[PDB]
Design a protein around this ligand. Structure first.
Ligand SMILES: CCCCCCCCCCCCC/C=C\[C@H](O)[C@H](N)CO
Ligand SMILES: [Cl-]
Ligand SMILES: [Cl-]
Ligand SMILES: [Cl-]
Ligand SMILES: [K+]
Lengths: 64, 52, 242, 282, 52
């Protein structure tokens, strides 16, 4: 599945540390099922790409 | 033939074929912040490829 | 007679000198040429042709060489495992030696350009799965995990989708040309590392093999060129040919 | 008129320098190829990544088959010793076969057919590299021409065959040779027999022998009624020129054993590539 | 009045007054690499303010 997401906030820019603009949810609404003998390891992988990244207010590095 | 695809950005490329098309949240494309909405006065840095 | 002075070089025989020597058969006319398909004018025409990469070049294969022509993928029990790794250095000893490209560029001291590797999945039609293929430019050794390798140039492939996929190895060098890379000072011209990881997993239903193989084909792109013609180390007159 | 049933797509292009690279961005399925067809991926940089413009002026002139082949290489070593089993006769007849030295051979066997003219250079000296005032005669004896049976043989009259007379002290002798096959091209591989008939195991040395490649004999001698006191070593170098080639093929990956066939050492079959311990470790 | 000065780049500014003028090495100004001289094909990242 693929979803493009635009920036959403009540402010133009914000801290990437103190505020999470949104969450991504992956929920099995219809449970996984298969006959025994078929591959049981069914992984889910998430790949994301930020778009139009902009940063401002340069200073020293802060982890939180 | 909507399933068949390939999106490239930066030095990375995804090839999706059992795709269910693509969703553009709330019908809007991402975009750098426009001057009318902007508030902070320093010139922002826009790294491009290394981050997008 | 006309005043002349012999200069250094006189009497020498330079194997690569392109001069004019006297003809032994005056008035001779060669059998006329006829049309023959497949004429080639430049070695590059050949380097653009995919040949098989011996990615599975193990010491345990040497007695059953056919096995080197393809490597396996199978149902993983652990996520994000590493499937295979190898250097992109084409003129270097290793997987590339098996390709017409590698053999030919060994007849030249330097090269330049982009390369492409095509992977073909030869598993059953019922098998599906996604792989992450990455090219890590010089500097970093083999990425320890998929999350590290993912930071480099990569492609995410899906079988069910298409049976083959092409990874492009962009020419990313400091110098305009690279000399053949090898251990030592010449490791400076290394091209980098290619890694293949499990993005999701090799999934198959009841009734189909849990292990299948992939064939790797490699060749050069249009911007590829070579210079400084030399002798290949890949052939030897070990004994006398009778 | 009273009967109604009785009434190449690819071409060349001149590319002096390597193709360039054009810029691209964040945007049709060109990454996934159908290599099952027998085609090489037509996918380039601009497709799989974001690129910059690069004005590439790298030249492709050195990879032209002409610059690759027109480099003189050793094709024969002929010796005329004075004391021994070889030729204490003062003359030598050599059947022309250039497949006795690998470096050159492997290069030619990259192609199935080749047509060209050639420059032969004759480097002669004593076996230790020393030179002495000795007069020599090299003569080309085409198929059918009488071969010298001695240093005195009438054939050295060379009234029609071409001969070269030179001193071991003069520079190397050098001449140009035309394309002499009776066929349109020399062929390094001939999947067949030269004649009709049953091909019993006694005459299997026939397989692969192509008459169109057999250019005769090359004879040499010291120019004298009397025997010469000097052992002689003649190295023959060949420089291909005005060449055209067809049908590329896999490059030899096993040591050569014989001039006339691709036989290989079956017990020690070398792998094209070096080996390592694991497929996941460099 | 060559001594008197002030050069600004990024979010930083230097004010020099007992200056001895300014030297431009070998008479050439710094510049991003031109396409004719370039060799590597990937699109470079030019961070600008955060690094310059
Ligand atoms: C006085 C100068 C004499 C020089 C004459 C030399 C003529 C040699 C012609 C070149 C022929 C090309 C070689 C052709 C075929 C290969 O040797 C075959 N594999 C031998 O069976
Ligand atoms: Cl290399
Ligand atoms: Cl005589
Ligand atoms: Cl030529
Ligand atoms: K005179």
């Amino acid at each position: 599945a693929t979803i493009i997401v635009p920036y959403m906030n009540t402010v133009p820019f914000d801290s990437a540390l103190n505020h999470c603009n949104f969450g991504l949810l992956v929920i099995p609404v219809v449970p996984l099922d298969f006959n025994t003998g078929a591959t049981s390891e069914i992984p889910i992988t998430v790949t994301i790409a930020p778009m139009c990244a902009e940063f401002a207010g340069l200073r020293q590095a802060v982890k939180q | 033939s909507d399933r068949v695809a390939q999106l490239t950005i930066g030095n990375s490329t995804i090839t999706t074929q059992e795709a269910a098309n693509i969703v553009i949240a709330y019908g809007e494309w991402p975009e750098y912040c426009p001057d009318t909405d902007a508030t902070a006065v320093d010139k922002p840095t826009r790294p491009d490829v290394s981050v997008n | 007679g006309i005043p002349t002075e012999l200069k250094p070089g006189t009497n020498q025989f330079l194997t690569t000198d392109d001069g004019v020597s006297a003809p032994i058969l005056p008035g001779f006319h060669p059998t006329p040429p006829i049309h023959i398909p497949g004429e080639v004018h430049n070695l590059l025409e050949i380097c653009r042709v995919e040949t098989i990469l011996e990615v599975n070049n193990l010491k345990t294969n040497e007695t059953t060489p056919m096995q080197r022509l393809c490597f396996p993928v199978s149902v993983q029990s652990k996520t994000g495992e590493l499937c295979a790794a190898f250097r992109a250095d084409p003129g270097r000893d290793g997987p590339w030696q098996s390709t017409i490209l590698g053999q030919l560029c060994r007849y030249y001291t330097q090269w330049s350009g982009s390369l492409e590797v095509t992977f073909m999945f030869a598993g059953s039609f019922m098998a599906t799965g996604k792989m992450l293929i990455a090219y890590t430019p010089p500097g970093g050794n083999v990425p320890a995990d998929r999350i590290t390798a993912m930071l480099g140039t990569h492609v995410i492939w899906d079988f069910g989708l298409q049976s083959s996929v092409t990874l492009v190895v962009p020419w990313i060098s400091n110098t305009h040309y690279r000399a053949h890379a090898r251990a030592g000072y010449f490791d400076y011209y290394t091209t980098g590392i290619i890694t293949i990881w499990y993005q999701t997993n090799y999934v198959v239903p009841i009734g189909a093999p849990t292990t299948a193989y992939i064939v790797a084909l490699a060749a050069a792109q249009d911007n590829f060129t070579m210079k400084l013609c030399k002798d290949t180390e890949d052939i030897e007159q070990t004994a006398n040919i009778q | 008129d009273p009967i109604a049933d009785m009434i190449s797509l690819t071409a060349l292009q001149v590319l002096p320098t390597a193709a360039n690279t054009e810029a691209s961005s964040h945007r049709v399925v060109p990454a996934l190829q159908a290599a099952e067809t027998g085609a090489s991926s037509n996918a380039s940089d601009k497709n799989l990544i974001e690129t910059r413009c690069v004005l590439n002026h790298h030249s492709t002139q050195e990879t032209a088959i002409g610059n690759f082949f027109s480099r003189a290489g050793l094709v024969s070593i002929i010796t005329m010793p004075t004391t021994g089993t070889q030729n204490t006769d003062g003359y030598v007849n050599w059947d022309i076969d250039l497949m006795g030295y690998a470096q050159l051979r492997r290069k030619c066997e990259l192609f199935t057919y080749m047509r060209f003219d050639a420059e032969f250079t004759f480097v002669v000296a004593k076996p230790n590299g020393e030179l002495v005032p000795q007069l020599l005669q090299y003569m080309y004896v085409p198929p059918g021409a009488p071969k010298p049976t001695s240093r005195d043989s009438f054939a050295w009259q060379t009234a029609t065959n071409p001969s070269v007379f030179v001193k071991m002290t003069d520079p190397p002798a050098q001449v140009s040779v035309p394309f002499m096959s009776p066929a349109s091209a020399y062929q390094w591989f001939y999947d067949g027999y030269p004649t009709f008939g049953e091909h019993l195991q006694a005459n299997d040395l026939d397989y692969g022998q192509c008459p169109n490649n057999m250019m005769g004999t090359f004879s040499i001698r010291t120019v004298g009624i009397e025997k010469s006191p000097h052992s002689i070593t003649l190295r023959v170098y060949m420089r291909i020129k005005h060449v055209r080639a067809w049908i590329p093929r896999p490059l030899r990956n096993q040591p050569y054993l014989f001039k006339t066939n691709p036989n290989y050492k079956g017990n020690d079959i070398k792998c094209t590539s070096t080996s390592r311990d694991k497929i996941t470790t460099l």
